[PDB]
């Protein structure tokens, strides 16, 4: 009677880039959990903490659905642990997690023949970031702390572009991601 808005966040037309991932809280509905069981559409579908039979248990306090776009080589970093250029600078999952990580290949949409330069990823930042904390600030990095303005002496801009094409391999093709996170915590539904 009230189907949850999985039909908005999964089938969207522009996922945000991984430095500026969004989040849509979903509550007070009924979750279908049966249209995302196609095994040749998605790729990963790996879940920690709970099994992949979530149609029965109503882990339904809230479900936070983050979503971004990563390169094919580093969709493995969307996982607990996993030190790397994506996962300790852009989106750090905590060590415990009841979350569900889903991903899928989108060479058809997000990659062109001339070259996509619209998705970004922050690659160089002062230290690690904690679980679930994002950064959107684009100020130029300098390894001393004091600020620069590049192209001056050995201090660059803290972002890069994925550079998506349609001629490259699998590992450089875009993978759209959506990360659920069940947060049961003794609430009403």
């Amino acid at each position, epitope marked *: 009677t009230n189907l949850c808005p999985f039909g908005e966040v999964f089938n969207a037309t522009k996922f945000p880039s991984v430095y500026a991932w969004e989040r849509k809280k979903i509550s007070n509905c009924v979750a279908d959990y049966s249209v995302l*069981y*196609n*095994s*040749t559409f998605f*790729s*990963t*579908f*790996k879940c920690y903490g709970v*099994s*992949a039979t979530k149609l029965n248990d109503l882990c339904f306090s809230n479900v936070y659905a983050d979503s971004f776009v990563v390169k*094919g080589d580093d*969709v*493995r*970093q969307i*996982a*607990p*642990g*996993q*030190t790397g250029v994506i996962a300790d600078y852009n989106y750090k999952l905590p*060590d415990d997690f009841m979350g569900c990580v889903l*991903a899928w290949n989108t060479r058809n949409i997000d990659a062109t023949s001339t070259g996509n330069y619209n998705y970004k990823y922050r690659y160089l930042r002062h230290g690690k970031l904690r679980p679930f904390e994002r950064d959107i600030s684009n100020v130029p990095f300098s390894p001393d702390g004091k600020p620069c303005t590049p192209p001056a002496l050995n201090c660059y801009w803290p972002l890069n572009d994925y550079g998506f094409y349609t001629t490259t391999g*699998i*590992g450089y093709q875009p993978y759209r991601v959506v990360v659920l996170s069940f947060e049961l915590l003794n609430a009403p539904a």
Partner: antibody
Framework: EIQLQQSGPELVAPGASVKVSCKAS????????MYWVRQSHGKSLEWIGY????????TYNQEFKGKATLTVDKSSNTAYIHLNSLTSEDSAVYYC???????????????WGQGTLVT | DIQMTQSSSYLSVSLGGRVTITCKAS??????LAWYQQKPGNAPRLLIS???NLETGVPSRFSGSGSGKNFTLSIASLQTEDVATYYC?????????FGGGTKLEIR
């Protein structure tokens, strides 16, 4: 290339305990899991469990709850299975496996070792 | 403990023919299946991830089919290498049970 290799062939009298390694080399070992399947001579393939490398948390098929204690050594990228209370009817090859580098599902194995053997 | 069994352990089709291997399911698996292949003396290799997505780096004769409980796999025509056994595996429950196997020996 992704190169996994176990130890050499093994042999033991019943009532003892065996340890056999599976050295991982050619990728970042803290990323993928390490699975362990069992295969008797000319028979089906039967599971033992899996092990997350960075965390050390394990999960066993309940056939082998008191027979195998999985562990791992993150320093030199070597995974182990420590067989305990072993007897005959265990004479089988023991493969170490991991998931595909671009698939991402749990049980789908796409990179296997050579294979040990026990008596 | 969900189960996945195959009908025949032996199936003999001559070279250049057309084979059909089937694996039934004990309970329901949605769409999640995998196929394997091992010539004796080696380790098995992943063949068909999902029901019909071929693994990259394989001949294109194989194509799985079927949904629901019943599942299958067909080869176009045999060669000198496709004389090995084939395991049908699900990955929908926890204990990812394989099949009984099916050997294709030349008649």
């Amino acid at each position: 290339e992704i190169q996994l290799q176990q130890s050499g062939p093994e042999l033991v009298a019943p009532g003892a305990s065996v340890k056999v390694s599976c050295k991982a080399s050619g990728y970042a070992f803290t990323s993928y899991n390490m699975y362990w399947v069992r295969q008797s001579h000319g028979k089906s393939l039967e599971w033992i469990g899996y092990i997350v490398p960075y965390n050390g948390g394990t999960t066993y098929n309940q056939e082998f709850k008191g027979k195998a204690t999985l562990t791992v050594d993150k320093s030199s990228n070597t995974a182990y299975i420590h067989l305990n209370s072993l007897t005959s009817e265990d004479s089988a090859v023991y493969y170490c496996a991991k998931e595909g580098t671009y698939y991402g599902y749990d049980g789908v194995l796409a990179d296997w070792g050579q294979g040990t053997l026990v008596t | 403990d969900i189960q996945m069994t195959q009908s025949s352990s032996y199936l003999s089709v001559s070279l250049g023919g057309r084979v059909t291997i089937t694996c039934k399911a004990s309970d329901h698996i949605n769409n999640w299946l995998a196929w394997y292949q091992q010539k004796p003396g080696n380790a098995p290799r992943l063949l068909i991830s999902g029901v019909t997505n071929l693994e990259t780096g394989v001949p294109s004769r194989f194509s799985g089919s079927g949904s629901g409980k019943n599942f299958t796999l067909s080869i176009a025509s045999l060669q000198t290498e496709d004389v090995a056994t084939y395991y049908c595996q699900q990955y929908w429950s926890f204990p990812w049970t394989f099949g009984g196997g099916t050997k294709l020996e030349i008649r």
